[PDB]
Amino acid sequence: KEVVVSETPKRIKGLEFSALSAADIVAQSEVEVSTRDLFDLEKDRAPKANGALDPKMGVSSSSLECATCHGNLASCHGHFGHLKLALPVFHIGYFKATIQILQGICKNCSAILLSETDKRQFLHELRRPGVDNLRRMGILKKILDQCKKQRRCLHCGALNGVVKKAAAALKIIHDTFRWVGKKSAPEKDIWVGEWKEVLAHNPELERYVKRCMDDLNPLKTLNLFKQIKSADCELLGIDATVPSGRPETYIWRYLPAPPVCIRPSVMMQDSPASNEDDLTVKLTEIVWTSSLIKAGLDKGISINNMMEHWDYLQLTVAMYINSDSVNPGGKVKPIRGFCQRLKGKQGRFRGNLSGKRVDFSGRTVISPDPNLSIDEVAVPDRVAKVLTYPEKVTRYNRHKLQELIVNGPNVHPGANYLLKRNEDARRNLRYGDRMKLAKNLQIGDVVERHLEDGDVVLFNRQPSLHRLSILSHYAKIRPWRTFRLNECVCTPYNADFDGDEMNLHVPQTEEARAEAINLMGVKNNLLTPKSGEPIIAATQDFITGSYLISHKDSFYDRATLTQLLSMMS
Amino acid sequence: YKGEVLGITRFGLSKMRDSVLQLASFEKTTDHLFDAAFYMKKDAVEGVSECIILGQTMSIGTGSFKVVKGTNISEKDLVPKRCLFESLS
Amino acid sequence: TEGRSRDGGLRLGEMERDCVIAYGASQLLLERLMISSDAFEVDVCDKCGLMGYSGWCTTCKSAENIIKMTIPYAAKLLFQELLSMNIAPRLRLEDIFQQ
Amino acid sequence: EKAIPKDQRATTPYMTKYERARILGTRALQISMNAPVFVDLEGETDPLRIAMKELAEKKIPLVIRRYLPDGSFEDWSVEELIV
Amino acid sequence: FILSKIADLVRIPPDQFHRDTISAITHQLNNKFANKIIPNVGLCITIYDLLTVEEGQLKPGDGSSYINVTFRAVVFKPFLGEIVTGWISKCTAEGIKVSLLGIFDDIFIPQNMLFEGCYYTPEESAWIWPMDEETKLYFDVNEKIRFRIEREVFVDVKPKSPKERELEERAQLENEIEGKNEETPQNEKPPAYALLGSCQTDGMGLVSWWE
Amino acid sequence: TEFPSIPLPINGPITNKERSLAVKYINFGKTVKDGPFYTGSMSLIIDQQENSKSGKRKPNIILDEDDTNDGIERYSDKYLKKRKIGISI
Amino acid sequence: MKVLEERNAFLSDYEVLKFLTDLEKKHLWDQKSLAALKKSRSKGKQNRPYNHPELQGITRNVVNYLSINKNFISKMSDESFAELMTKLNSFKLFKAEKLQIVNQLPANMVHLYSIVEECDARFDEKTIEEMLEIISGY
Amino acid sequence: VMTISSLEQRTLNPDLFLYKELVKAHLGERAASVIGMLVALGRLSVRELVEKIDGMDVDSVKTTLVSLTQLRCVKYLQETAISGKKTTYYYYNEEGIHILLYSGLIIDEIITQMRVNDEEEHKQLVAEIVQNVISLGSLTVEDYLSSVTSDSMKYTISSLFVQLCEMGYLIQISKLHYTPIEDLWQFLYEKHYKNIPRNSPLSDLKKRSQAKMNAKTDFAKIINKPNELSQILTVDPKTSLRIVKPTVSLTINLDRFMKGRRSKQLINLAKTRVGSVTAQVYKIALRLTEQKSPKIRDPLTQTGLLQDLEEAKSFQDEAELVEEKTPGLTFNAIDLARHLPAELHSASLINSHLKILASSNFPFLNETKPGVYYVPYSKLMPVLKSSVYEYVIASTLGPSAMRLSRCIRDNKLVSEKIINSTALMKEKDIRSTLASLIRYNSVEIQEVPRTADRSASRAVFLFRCKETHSYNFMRQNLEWNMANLLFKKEKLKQENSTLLKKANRDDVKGRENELLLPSELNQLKMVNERELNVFARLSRLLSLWEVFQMA
DNA sequence: TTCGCGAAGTAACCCTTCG
DNA sequence: CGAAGGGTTACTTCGCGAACACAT
Numbered sequence A: 001k002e003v004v005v006s007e008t009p010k011r012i013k014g015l016e017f018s019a020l021s022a023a024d025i026v027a028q029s030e031v032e033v034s035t036r037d038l039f040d041l042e043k044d045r046a047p048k049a050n051g052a053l054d055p056k057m058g059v060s061s062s063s064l065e066c067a068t069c070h071g072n073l074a075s076c077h078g079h080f081g082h083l084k085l086a087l088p089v090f091h092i093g094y095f096k097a098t099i100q101i102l103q104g105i106c107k108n109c110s111a112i113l114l115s116e117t118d119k120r121q122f123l124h125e126l127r128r129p130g131v132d133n134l135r136r137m138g139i140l141k142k143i144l145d146q147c148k149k150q151r152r153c154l155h156c157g158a159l160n161g162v163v164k165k166a167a168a169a170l171k172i173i174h175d176t177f178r179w180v181g182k183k184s185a186p187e188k189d190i191w192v193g194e195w196k197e198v199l200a201h202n203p204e205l206e207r208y209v210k211r212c213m214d215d216l217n218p219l220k221t222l223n224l225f226k227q228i229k230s231a232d233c234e235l236l237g238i239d240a241t242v243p244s245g246r247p248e249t250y251i252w253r254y255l256p257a258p259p260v261c262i263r264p265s266v267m268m269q270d271s272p273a274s275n276e277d278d279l280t281v282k283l284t285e286i287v288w289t290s291s292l293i294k295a296g297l298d299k300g301i302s303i304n305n306m307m308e309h310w311d312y313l314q315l316t317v318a319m320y321i322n323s324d325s326v327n328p329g330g331k332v333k334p335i336r337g338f339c340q341r342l343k344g345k346q347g348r349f350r351g352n353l354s355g356k357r358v359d360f361s362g363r364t365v366i367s368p369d370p371n372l373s374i375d376e377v378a379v380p381d382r383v384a385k386v387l388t389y390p391e392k393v394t395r396y397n398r399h400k401l402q403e404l405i406v407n408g409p410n411v412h413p414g415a416n417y418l419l420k421r422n423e424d425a426r427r428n429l430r431y432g433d434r435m436k437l438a439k440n441l442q443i444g445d446v447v448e449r450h451l452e453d454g455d456v457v458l459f460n461r462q463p464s465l466h467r468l469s470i471l472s473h474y475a476k477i478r479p480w481r482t483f484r485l486n487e488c489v490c491t492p493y494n495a496d497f498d499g500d501e502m503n504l505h506v507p508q509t510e511e512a513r514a515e516a517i518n519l520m521g522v523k524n525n526l527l528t529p530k531s532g533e534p535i536i537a538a539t540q541d542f543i544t545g546s547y548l549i550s551h552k553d554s555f556y557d558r559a560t561l562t563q564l565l566s567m568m569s
Numbered sequence B: 001y002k003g004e005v006l007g008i009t010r011f012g013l014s015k016m017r018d019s020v021l022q023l024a025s026f027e028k029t030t031d032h033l034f035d036a037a038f039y040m041k042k043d044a045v046e047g048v049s050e051c052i053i054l055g056q057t058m059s060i061g062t063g064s065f066k067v068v069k070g071t072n073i074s075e076k077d078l079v080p081k082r083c084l085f086e087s088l089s
Numbered sequence C: 001t002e003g004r005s006r007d008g009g010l011r012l013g014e015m016e017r018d019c020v021i022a023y024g025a026s027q028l029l030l031e032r033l034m035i036s037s038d039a040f041e042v043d044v045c046d047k048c049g050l051m052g053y054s055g056w057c058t059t060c061k062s063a064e065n066i067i068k069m070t071i072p073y074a075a076k077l078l079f080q081e082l083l084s085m086n087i088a089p090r091l092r093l094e095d096i097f098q099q
Numbered sequence D: 001e002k003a004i005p006k007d008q009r010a011t012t013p014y015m016t017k018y019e020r021a022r023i024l025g026t027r028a029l030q031i032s033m034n035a036p037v038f039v040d041l042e043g044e045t046d047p048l049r050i051a052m053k054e055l056a057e058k059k060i061p062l063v064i065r066r067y068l069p070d071g072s073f074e075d076w077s078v079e080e081l082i083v
Numbered sequence E: 001f002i003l004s005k006i007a008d009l010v011r012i013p014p015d016q017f018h019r020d021t022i023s024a025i026t027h028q029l030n031n032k033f034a035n036k037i038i039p040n041v042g043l044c045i046t047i048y049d050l051l052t053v054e055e056g057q058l059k060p061g062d063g064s065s066y067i068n069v070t071f072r073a074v075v076f077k078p079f080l081g082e083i084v085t086g087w088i089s090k091c092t093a094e095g096i097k098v099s100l101l102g103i104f105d106d107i108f109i110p111q112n113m114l115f116e117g118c119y120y121t122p123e124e125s126a127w128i129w130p131m132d133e134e135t136k137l138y139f140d141v142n143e144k145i146r147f148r149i150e151r152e153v154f155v156d157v158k159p160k161s162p163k164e165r166e167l168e169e170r171a172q173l174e175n176e177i178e179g180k181n182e183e184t185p186q187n188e189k190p191p192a193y194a195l196l197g198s199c200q201t202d203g204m205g206l207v208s209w210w211e
Numbered sequence F: 001t002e003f004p005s006i007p008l009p010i011n012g013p014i015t016n017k018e019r020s021l022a023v024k025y026i027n028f029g030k031t032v033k034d035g036p037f038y039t040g041s042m043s044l045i046i047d048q049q050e051n052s053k054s055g056k057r058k059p060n061i062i063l064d065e066d067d068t069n070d071g072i073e074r075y076s077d078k079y080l081k082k083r084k085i086g087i088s089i
Numbered sequence G: 001m002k003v004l005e006e007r008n009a010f011l012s013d014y015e016v017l018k019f020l021t022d023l024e025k026k027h028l029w030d031q032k033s034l035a036a037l038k039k040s041r042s043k044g045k046q047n048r049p050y051n052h053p054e055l056q057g058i059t060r061n062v063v064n065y066l067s068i069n070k071n072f073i074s075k076m077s078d079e080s081f082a083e084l085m086t087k088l089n090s091f092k093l094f095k096a097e098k099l100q101i102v103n104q105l106p107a108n109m110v111h112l113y114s115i116v117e118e119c120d121a122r123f124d125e126k127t128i129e130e131m132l133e134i135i136s137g138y
Numbered sequence H: 001v002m003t004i005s006s007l008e009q010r011t012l013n014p015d016l017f018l019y020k021e022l023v024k025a026h027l028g029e030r031a032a033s034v035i036g037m038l039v040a041l042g043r044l045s046v047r048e049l050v051e052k053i054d055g056m057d058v059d060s061v062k063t064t065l066v067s068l069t070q071l072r073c074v075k076y077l078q079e080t081a082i083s084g085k086k087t088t089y090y091y092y093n094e095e096g097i098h099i100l101l102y103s104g105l106i107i108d109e110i111i112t113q114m115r116v117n118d119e120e121e122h123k124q125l126v127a128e129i130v131q132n133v134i135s136l137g138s139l140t141v142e143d144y145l146s147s148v149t150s151d152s153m154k155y156t157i158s159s160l161f162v163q164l165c166e167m168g169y170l171i172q173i174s175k176l177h178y179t180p181i182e183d184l185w186q187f188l189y190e191k192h193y194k195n196i197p198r199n200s201p202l203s204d205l206k207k208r209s210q211a212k213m214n215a216k217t218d219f220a221k222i223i224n225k226p227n228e229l230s231q232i233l234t235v236d237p238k239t240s241l242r243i244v245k246p247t248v249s250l251t252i253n254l255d256r257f258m259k260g261r262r263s264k265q266l267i268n269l270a271k272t273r274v275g276s277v278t279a280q281v282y283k284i285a286l287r288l289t290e291q292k293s294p295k296i297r298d299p300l301t302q303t304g305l306l307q308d309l310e311e312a313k314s315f316q317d318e319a320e321l322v323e324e325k326t327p328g329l330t331f332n333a334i335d336l337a338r339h340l341p342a343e344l345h346s347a348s349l350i351n352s353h354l355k356i357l358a359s360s361n362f363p364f365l366n367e368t369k370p371g372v373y374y375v376p377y378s379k380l381m382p383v384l385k386s387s388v389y390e391y392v393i394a395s396t397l398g399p400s401a402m403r404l405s406r407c408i409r410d411n412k413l414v415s416e417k418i419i420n421s422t423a424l425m426k427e428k429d430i431r432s433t434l435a436s437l438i439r440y441n442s443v444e445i446q447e448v449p450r451t452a453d454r455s456a457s458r459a460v461f462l463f464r465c466k467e468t469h470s471y472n473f474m475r476q477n478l479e480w481n482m483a484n485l486l487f488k489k490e491k492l493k494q495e496n497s498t499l500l501k502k503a504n505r506d507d508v509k510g511r512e513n514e515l516l517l518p519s520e521l522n523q524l525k526m527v528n529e530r531e532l533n534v535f536a537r538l539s540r541l542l543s544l545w546e547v548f549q550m551a
Numbered sequence I: 001t002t003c004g005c006g007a008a009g010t011a012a013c014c015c016t017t018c019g
Numbered sequence J: 001c002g003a004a005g006g007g008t009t010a011c012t013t014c015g016c017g018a019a020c021a022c023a024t
């Protein structure tokens, strides 16, 4: 009973990139999608059960507990779901790199068109220890140029042309009758022999619609990417010892659906119900097309209508990512998914990972005050009531954080919250007993006191050109509600007391508070880094008062001198 | 140091950076992630751009080392094996 | 939340984290970007590293080698966006100790 | 990979300002977690000011481990790093 | 009673930096190997001493000395054949269920003939001894059972799934004021120490025919 | 699930020929997990078969047999019935 | 967790008590059991150590098992253990039966038959009485 | 979560899924972790082998490959660089691991090949000889005969050695077919340009006419050397009969049994092509020419890496040139082999009943047309594929599948309007069985359009065949079903291993004499019932997989 | 409704060899 | 010596960015 458990606080090293195989999409398969999915807002006062959103893929509200993570919007992580679709479809991101596999191999035997000596001559340069990414691009371009000029195959008896796009929609229209044109091929002979039989039945396209070779649709190249190799697909650039490095996982066969943590609900304008995400509307749209393309095998409707439905499928799922297509004037392209919420100026790498909104802050208009020390900012007595520092109690705090916890959240040398030793929750001092609660006060409580004089606190100016726009210097509790500081430290901020307001962040842990003042404070950063000149120094009323004491004729008595030396210090 | 006079912009940055998420935040954030999983890039995280995305300590400035607390172990407590089973009983 | 009259919470831009790197203070970037804003514990698996729930791998369904650690929520919600399209960001784990 | 013996050392015997602010932080974090002080305090709070007095009196029981680009762990002691 | 060489890393809080170094490591190792058993190594008792203790280093978020030690521990694990004294307290419809005096109460022995009779409690007696044709002595309670031990395997158990571990909340709903709540406690887990043998001396101070 | 069909499978080991091939597959799979068959691994390995491995291990190809590898494990039926030493298996 | 060896040198029963009597100061007994409500002493105002409820409960419950036979834990010394170990190695014995003899002391002949397997087919009749004279004397 | 349907590895590999499995089936994971590893990135030396398989050091990757060396499963390339040491660069062998899947049927119808002479002792003695031959990779005669301990039985075994050598089943295994054939040509080509570096005004005609053709006539002779080279056998004072040399190794020759299996496939075809009496004399007139000049199956030894410029017409012409007059024995005559005593009404058998095979080539295909015996095995293989391929797709997808798949072969680039005039489907059964077949190959459509973005639908999608894709795809699907059946066998033998270690060690004759209690004894006849069915499916699936990989 | 270089895509033309 | 194949350089098209953050 109660066996030994021991856990090591491990790091996070490396980030191995791969693609999800169809077996891995159906591994994270808590739900099964693409049966009806027009059910997510159903008749019985709108719950959901096996639709586009489920109570097995999380919670989109405060009530309605999830059936896998028994929690809510602040407890559930998220759950994926596979969406099986017939007649597979090109990946819109793996569409330029699909050619680089498919142009460098044959089209009948599907083997790589490359001599056996050049294989070792390329692997000796590619598997060298110490190959840069630029060197890898150079070698993978060097093998790419060689496999575009060999007009025939190696061990199949087949000719190969150039492979390009259709016109710029998401089709691969290539040719093979390009390199040899006079003693062309026996394939040319069987091509013109199986063309004379056609024109005795439909002479409409005898000369205009003749020069068009073939398509290379995803229904065929999925059965051709499976053929390719097992040992010579590393020359194409893909590692072949992890079981997801096969080139047929780059085509949509199974489709993962995102959780409801990705797709939230919608606020006011409550004339409809809780409105769906654009991802919800786009995900419930391809279910109808995937069921329409599947039921039409044993039903009837002809090859042109089924081709139009499959084209609508391949154009609707390729607009689910990056929305790089027209809509056959609704809005600003009317569709955002997975790249438009990741493109810069509103995305994740730009607007949620690098630059993010942070609590324990505040901004107010700046005003001048020369009577501060130069390492002292002066915050008002109401910002300090709502800016709070965790000061845990240990044997020097205990006699001070006990007279302070009876003082109250309203009186300024006081505290707002109090975290206990067992960390059940955070007790409010506004509603608590605050006399019996103030007496015990164990030595691990994380009672959070107001901001007082002597606290390390950052101070930022938003157009931060160089490193001296964010500085940290000590606090001071003052009257009327505006930030105020000296005027010698006013030139790196490029402040002019015009009405320009600046924001102010506080540290919360000891490890960052003890370095915010030590190598980032004002008194250490008196210079600039770019020149070595002192950047915080004289201002306008600093040298014009210093000049009028020294113009060879300011002669002072005893009584004026003692008053000057008294007002100075 | 790379070898050629190259730029700083979105094609001049990709000369040295094997870090993907650093390249997937500079420009063309879509195309750098689809190309890295195609080529099966390893991306050992050591740069300070990819270090605050995953939320851990950098390797520059303060985090360029670590501090170690002393133990004050004498050579008479632990270095002689205080074993009462000197003979197999 | 964003702006005024909902609640506060002010923003540290990309051109501001450039300044604090020049000081060299590395422990202030853990607070002002991860601890204060968005810190969320998560269950990751050791081999074939993905993120689970409540100590469950959900793909290598054994719940044996799951070692939890804290991560920014914008990094977790990035990964559920990357797995949603096609790509699999797999995270490997090493010890901070044993030198 | 292993540590250099103390007979020869390559780096400077000085105290860079990046290990003066880290040792001021990881000592003040230990005072907040109730470590015994080694200096006569004048009834002061704020463990940033206690660890500053520890650095001023040179009575701090820590050891700074420098890292080489190949890695040889170069153990330097704080009581002999001049500042 | 064997002696292992289990190695483990130890974190000490910054509270206890005033005590001795090897006294704070021994205090922390006793919070993990006192009653907690190692999987398929045996049952630990205490820590013997410490060995090869080096510099304790820190992480940037805790401020604790994560010191790295290796040590030997007095762990109770008998080898393939060992005579050991037990005590009977409960006898079900299955075989004899014994234990050491306050050590581990799951050392149950099934039928394992050279006993020839297995009852539950016919005349307030555990089993019947059909001797031929003298000294028909049996055993009921708290008597000097001197069984042998075998089979060495002790463990195959570690499941953990959220759809079944949160199904225990339904067992807590079944833990209501209904008295006969024999749904969840009758199906417990077999621990990492499951031990059995052959026979016990027939019965206390006697011949003990072929082990 | 999904019900396609294969023409061949049912009603075909009742005859003696397919049963003969199947039982011979069982016999080949049972014998092949024995390595060298009591006379082998000695003659033709030096004779132009991987000179860099038949020169570095000239007496060390005799590791696989059924005369000693099936011999050493059959001595232990008698060393345990007469003597007992406490060593892990 | 990395286990180096599952056994280093498996140990006897008597020096477990000798390791426990130096550990009894860590887990104090009825000689200082009256200090649960007494005055200030030991420079702590209570004279008490920390609890360890998962270790204080077992460090009393192990030695209750080690006193089962010789009640009415052995009363020998270290030099007596050395003398009974020196004279025991003169016979060709296996290590397992050495540990089973030094664990519990056989008083009669048939417990020596239960510890020493196939004693009639391996040993002589003069050795058994000498072993009983050495063991059952103390 | 319903992992019963083998969805766990649908995008895994088709080639790794069989080879690593067959290596694991006889030794285990430490041998399957190299042939399954050398099939995933190509050729590799020993130094760059250790750090990727995640295992033991060079002391284990060398030992387990010796077990693959004396089993003939890998190929090595002994060559040096201009500045480096002597490297190894091991390969993987296709037929050298087909032998492990193939050995049981090898011995079991080499029995039927050797059925001719007598009845009782020959079957058991061949089942003792060849079973020990294939279980090793290379053995001699004097090493086998050191465990007989007899005087006349040893004489019978020594007779059967040369009786198996005269058939074409035992040849001397040399290095020249133990070397990779894709680089054995290049070794016969780089010293051949080194042979003539003459300073003389010779154009690129030297690189196509002199060196290429002389390497052809020096390569085709040297690949035919292991056919018959160990023929002296004139040791008189030991035995009074032809005795095989003791210090001469022997292998299986790997290629005549290929020919016997494909001839069995031809006879199984001829049982349906011609009547019941013509196929018997066709068998007795076909099963005698397999032992003289072997080149019937093989995609040719040289055509693997030089058919890139124009040479395919020369390959077909040389194939049909040496394809005749080399087996040129009596084309239609009498022989003292076997006449099958039956009505094989015709109660007279000379020159009148043995002329019925002359009326076997003028009807539907057996294809021995021109003069007497010319071209019997060249123009069958593009249709022997097409005869078996239609009988699988018609027996699987329905009788209306061969009605649509054979129409498009007649006229490629066919419309749906003119296929309605050729077929008889009602209104929509043209396209319904097309959509039921379009997920499989041999449907492959080509599009016409001259529009911008498919405006007025342009009368597009006329159907072709592209028959070179679907044969390879059928071969992939059959090979995957093969290896999946073997993994069903492997999971069956892995499920219950606690009742197998005792059932074969000491339980031989008393298995029915109450050694197992009657609660699980039916599992012993359940682990032997459908494990018999796995090998029966394997036996009846080898007879269909090996038709799609002809020359 | 705009400049910046880097991807493909396609044509004019020169070197090299064949019979 | 005239003609055919391989290959270098030159003319033309697309897309990705365009600064921080507050109140609407």
Ligand SMILES: [Mg+2]
Binding pocket: A496, A497, A498, A499, A500
């Ligand atoms: Mg202004």
Ligand SMILES: [Zn+2]
Binding pocket: A056, A057, A058, A059, A066, A067, A068, A069, A070, A071, A076, A077, A078, A079
């Ligand atoms: Zn949930």
Ligand SMILES: [Zn+2]
Binding pocket: A106, A107, A108, A109, A110, A111, A153, A154, A155, A156, A157, A158
């Ligand atoms: Zn090809």
Ligand SMILES: [Zn+2]
Binding pocket: C045, C046, C047, C048, C049, C050, C057, C059, C060
């Ligand atoms: Zn996992």
